[PDB]
């Protein structure tokens, strides 16, 4: 039964035909600040239906000599949609997200993806992402084959054309700013090439989309 | 006798430590103690009463030393005009160090609560006027103007028979404690400013005085608490004594 | 619970259609779940292996160099008799390494300072070791004014003593210690200066390290202390994949981009062993 | 744990308890 | 799970990528050999670049049954079926596939479900095993794992000819390590 | 749910992803030799798991002009593990056996295969078993068409890649030596040839695993 | 509870200096005699004056030492 | 000052007094001075098998056994149980030098299969080699059987 | 602290000693024990062949 | 035995139980 998938949130849905069943990030799903972890005095907003909801980012290409490409949450969304008015009006900031990732071609196509959440990726030496330098190191020191410890799936060519995550908030402070502070990094590697034969279409375009879950919002004061 | 072993931690003095001493006089009995007045059980019980706070710390000449203590208000066109800015941080180095609060906080790294500032109008009963105080949290620049201001939480002051109005700074923060903050990385824990504007005017009729001061007092509320005691910044000797 | 290792049940052939538990699909992003008793032919097995070595108490609980300290006569760097050490634990590459295995780390310390000279002789000289919080003042001399030490504290010993050791409680006001913090600490434009500030936590600065021998005058002998680190009452969370390549700087995951090595051993051939 | 303060953190690493949940890494499939 | 680096030949900068799968195609039919390397975890080699193989550095002695996952990552025409053995120790490399057959082994068959897994049971003489290496220690060795085509890769017109697989290690629920140690490989060259 | 089929004994395993359902041999379960059948007065040996795993004897190529193959047991195994040197050391053999069949193509290739078992294989005028001359007449002067009589199952390229069945122990006696008699023989015939349009792969190899069930030996002496 | 008296007031702290020297003007003789007084460095009077009146013991510790800092048979 | 450390087998052994091995961060060590009494650890049981052997009629690998492995004529792996490594805390040479004598006293102790003592004299460890050139009764001797 | 004295006979190392050492493993684990057969529990068992 | 530590192995040897099978080594005829 886990090959079509229909997920719907706020005033959007995505649909599926071949899917490759749900991962929830750390076996916990987003909720709201409780009553004794909270520090703030003044009552929260939560927006609720204006702000959860899939948005949709930018398209990349994926070529036969790609070498991957990183993006950053929540900055992506800052100047995006409600959501980003929000963020500015406001200094602390929480909140879960599910984020799905689009990738289709045919049955003489072959290939396959690493899609991956890593939460606070410290990158050593916006909304529409970067592309990795020495993808075997993460250009951060670390080797690429033991990513799999992190909530990850794969996009096979063969079997599936998505991949869904769904990420709780993962942070040791209650709240936090969202214009100072990533709290991690979603990674699409290609670990096997692309391949195919001429005179097929050459052209097999990724495309990212998220939806935030559970936000809130305090400590208004003027946007910056 | 009995078999013992010594652990890698003897022969050293701890100024912390809780010990047993020997006592130096066997059988001795001290004089007894009269109730006196006035006894203090915790250093947070004296945290709560309000203090002269020095918002005008423009002047430095001795003459003139007791004028921080109040800033002047008078009448203008009318435009919204600013009246006085600080930061609303206890334990970095500014208006705050003329207070109570100010001075024990420097004993302590670590601090959480809501504060309390009070404003005292000490003008002529013929004079009537209304400002508007705002406190902008974190993030946010100093405002350039009072439609700027007043978007982060504030209260409008109304004189008249109560003279005195309290600006209570909720404690809105992101970490349960905040360090003292300062120039450079240690901005981290900053938590804001205070600012004062005009509302309407400063109106006044014939025959009386054009000035008038004003006088702040600040406090913190019941739910204030410090931690982990330091050493003070200041050294007040200069040589043996 | 898990005291021990599990067990192995009895099994037998089976040949029947409908069931697979060999193939998978792993493209879900799940771990296997076929075991030996239903791949193979297995007997009975009771296993009694303790598990109690692997916890993260058993992992941790192990000193450890962190610091290093040098108290030259003659010499560019403390030649005054006085020394300054910001508390950090990235200095070494052992420690280090296993300490970032995971991102957020909360427990208790157990320090050890052991002193001798140079050459390791040990001579009668007596120091103070004196712990500055964030915010007090910092001495900058032998015979300066703040090691009255009137609220900070301090301890004095020899070096013909036993090593000194305290204990140390959890001083952060976050909920935990974390040693990756992607992001910048101040509200600032960040247009090439706040770099230098990338990564930098103050959740982690917990303080500063003071020394000093006890005395007016110069000393007569060169000292070196050395400062071990012990954890206890030790919980973390979400681990991370583990280091690879050298280290460059402290607190900073930057890596030799010229000199790239893989993680392990190569060979010739992939036919041949 | 043995401790002879008044304060805990200042007391042994003592015996944890021998507990694993394997499943929220492993399989964290809905 | 974690990506095994089966194919740890390329040393160069530029081709550091390509040590994480294996390439597969058509032969002739006369079941020839894919890849072998040996199943020690603790022993510098293809398990050096999993979790499993830098934590294992950490502790002198293990004991427990492995387990190891083939990926398939081909187009959706092409089919064939491999043979994995597992040889115990004591036997040396097999010459071909008629000698390599008579260990336990696993029959892979392409299809819907494009992954399988090799179970490699514990079998060994004592309760625990130190880590193997050249010499003496050369006691503990667990054995090898060999790879062998079956029939074929067949694929039809207009479809790539190359395919390749990824291979994924584990432990077991009855994997345990004892007597702590300290890591062989230190990362720094002098002061940081 | 008769599509996917793992079958494991002894130490091996085989997997498949298109199966035919499974063809029991006259619809009887191998079996031991029961008190009142048995005629030796010797206790037999019974190794068990040492000799019940499946085996891979050899490849075989399927042409385009193929006529078909032949094997005799338990003649292939004479040679081969375990079951080979107990049985040059025993003279009294009885067992079951389980055969698998694989041979696997593409969608755009086509032809059919017929998989049987035929007991007491006389033939008119190894482990590699031989290739029959006159297909027609079986070599033995029966037909063909008539073989379906015997447990027999297809390999429909189009269907299938896979065909399984179980043969209990035929024979008049008890117990009979395996190295001077032969109770069956299996034969593959192509009845609809290979086809394909040049530039598919033009090599489609047939492989032959096997596992005894059941085994029982007894009568030790030298090894003959 | 960090915040009590006597968790304020219970850290040691430095409230005198004797010197004993060889050649000097000071006590050139071996013996010396101090006032018992707080009042002679500023870090523990600043702390101590905060209040009017105090009742409480005390625990002294004398540490002593050449003038370079090194132990000698004394 | 000193510092004893235990390398467990597959740990990387120092190869100078300043080697970076010597941080100890897993494995157990310990620092002591010549002044102080002297140092003592309690050990436990730390072999694969059942029981420590004293003697191994085979050999440790698979191998052809020509003549290079009869070198490893019974080297038994389950008794090799690491390295011990001792060094001057410091980074110039030290003023003395130094003699260790390690002292090994055995409890909960069991025993199994004895067999009969030993004869002749040692010759190298982990062998029973003896000199066949000079060969000893076991006791002593007299001149005639039927005189004390 | 507690107040004590110390006998003169501290600091010696005495072979035939009983005394608690502090380990240096801590939370191991020994192997588990097999049945083998011939054990001995006295020198006297065997003093008598 | 006398424990001051949380491993067993640390103890003192303690006082043994004295039993003797002399019919294993000296009369094992069946
Ligand atoms: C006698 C006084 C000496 C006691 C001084 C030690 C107390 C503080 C130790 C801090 C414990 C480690 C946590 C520190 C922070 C992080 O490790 C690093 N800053 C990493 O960025
Ligand atoms: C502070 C660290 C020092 C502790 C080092 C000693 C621990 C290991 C002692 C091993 C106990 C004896 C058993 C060893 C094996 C056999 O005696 C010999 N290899 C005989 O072949």
Known sequence: ?224 | ?241 | ?273 | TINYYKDSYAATAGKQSLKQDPDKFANPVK
């Not at chain 1, 939806?211 to 919002?217: G, R, T, V």
């Not at chain 3, 390290?209 to 110069?218: C, P, Q």
Request: proline share 8%; glycine share 8%; hydrophobic share 35%.
């Open chain 1, 1 to 224: 039964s886990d090959r079509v998938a229909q997920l719907t949130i706020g005033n959007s849905t995505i649909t599926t035909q071949e899917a490759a069943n749900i991962i929830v990030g750390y076996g916990e799903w987003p909720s709201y600040c409780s009553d004794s972890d909270a520090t703030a005095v003044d009552k929260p907003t939560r927006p609720d239906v204006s702000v959860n909801r899939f948005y949709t980012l930018d398209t990349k290409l994926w070529e036969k000599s790609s070498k991957g490409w990183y993006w950053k949450f929540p900055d992506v969304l800052t100047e995006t949609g409600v959501f980003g008015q929000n963020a500015q009006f406001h200094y602390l900031y929480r909140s879960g997200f599910c984020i799905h990732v689009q990738c289709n071609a045919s049955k003489f196509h072959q290939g396959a993806l690493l899609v991956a959440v890593l939460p606070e990726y410290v990158i050593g030496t916006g909304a529409d992402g970067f592309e990795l330098q020495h993808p075997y190191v993460l250009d951060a020191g670390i080797p690429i084959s033991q990513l799999t410890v992190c909530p990850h799936q794969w996009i096979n060519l063969r079997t599936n054309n998505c991949a869904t995550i769904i990420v709780p908030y993962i942070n040791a402070l209650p709240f936090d700013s969202a214009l100072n502070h990533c709290n991690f990094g979603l990674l699409v590697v290609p670990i096997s090439p692309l391949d195919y034969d001429q005179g097929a279409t050459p052209v097999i375009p990724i495309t990212i989309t998220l939806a935030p879950m559970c936000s809130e919002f305090a400590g208004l004061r003027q946007a910056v």
């Open chain 2, 1 to 241: 006798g009995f078999p013992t072993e010594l652990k890698p931690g003897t022969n050293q003095f701890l100024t912390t430590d809780d010990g047993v001493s020997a006592p130096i006089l066997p059988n001795f009995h001290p004089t007894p103690c009269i109730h006196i007045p006035g006894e203090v059980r915790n250093l947070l019980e004296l945290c709560q009463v309000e203090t002269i706070l020095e918002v005008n710390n423009v002047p430095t000449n001795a003459t003139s030393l007791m004028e921080r203590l109040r800033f002047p208000v008078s009448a203008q066109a009318g435009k919204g005009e600013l009246c006085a800015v600080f930061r609303a941080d206890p334990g970095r180095n500014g208006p705050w160090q003329s207070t109570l609060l100010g001075q024990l906080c420097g004993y302590y790294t670590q601090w959480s609560g809501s504060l309390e500032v009070t404003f005292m109008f000490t003008g002529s009963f013929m004079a009537t006027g209304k400002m508007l105080i705002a406190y902008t949290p974190p993030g946010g620049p100093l405002p350039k103007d009072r439609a700027t201001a007043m978007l982060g939480t504030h209260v409008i002051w109304d004189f008249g028979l109560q003279s005195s109005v309290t600006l209570v700074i909720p404690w809105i923060s992101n970490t349960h404690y905040r360090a003292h903050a300062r120039d450079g990385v240690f901005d981290y824990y900053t938590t804001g400013l205070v600012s004062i504007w005009y509302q309407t005017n400063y109106v006044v009729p014939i025959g009386a005085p054009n000035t008038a001061y004003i006088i702040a007092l600040a406090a913190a509320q019941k739910n204030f608490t410090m931690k982990l005691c330091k050493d003070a910044s200041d050294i007040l000797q200069t040589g043996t004594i």
């Open chain 3, 1 to 273: 619970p898990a005291p021990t290792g599990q067990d192995t049940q009895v099994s037998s052939h089976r040949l029947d259609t409908g069931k697979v538990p060999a193939l998978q699909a792993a493209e879900i992003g799940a771990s296997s779940n076929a075991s030996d008793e239903s791949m193979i032919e297995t007997r009975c097995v009771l296993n009694s292996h303790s598990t109690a070595e692997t916890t993260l108490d058993s992992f941790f609980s192990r000193a450890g160099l962190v610091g290093e300290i040098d108290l030259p006569l003659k010499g560019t760097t403390n030649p005054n008799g006085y020394a300054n050490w910001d508390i950090d634990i990235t200095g070494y590459a052992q420690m280090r390494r296993k300490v970032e295995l995971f991102t957020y780390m909360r427990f208790d310390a157990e320090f050890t300072f052991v002193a001798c000279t140079p050459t390791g002789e040990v001579v009668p000289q007596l120091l103070q070791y004196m712990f500055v919080p964030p915010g007090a003042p910092k001495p900058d001399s032998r015979e300066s004014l703040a090691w009255q030490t009137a609220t900070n504290p301090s301890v004095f010993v020899k070096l013909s003593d036993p090593p000194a050791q305290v204990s140390v409680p959890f001083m952060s006001p976050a909920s935990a210690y974390q040693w990756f913090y992607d992001g910048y600490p101040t509200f600032g434009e960040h247009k090439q200066e706040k770099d230098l500030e990338y990564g930098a936590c103050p959740n982690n600065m917990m303080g500063t390290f003071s020394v000093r021998t006890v005395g007016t005058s110069k000393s007569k002998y060169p000292l070196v202390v050395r400062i071990y680190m012990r954890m206890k009452h030790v919980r973390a969370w979400i681990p991370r994949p583990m280091r690879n390549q050298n280290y460059l700087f402290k607190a900073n995951p930057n890596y030799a981009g010229n000199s790239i090595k893989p993680t392990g051993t190569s060979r010739t051939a992939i036919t041949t062993l």
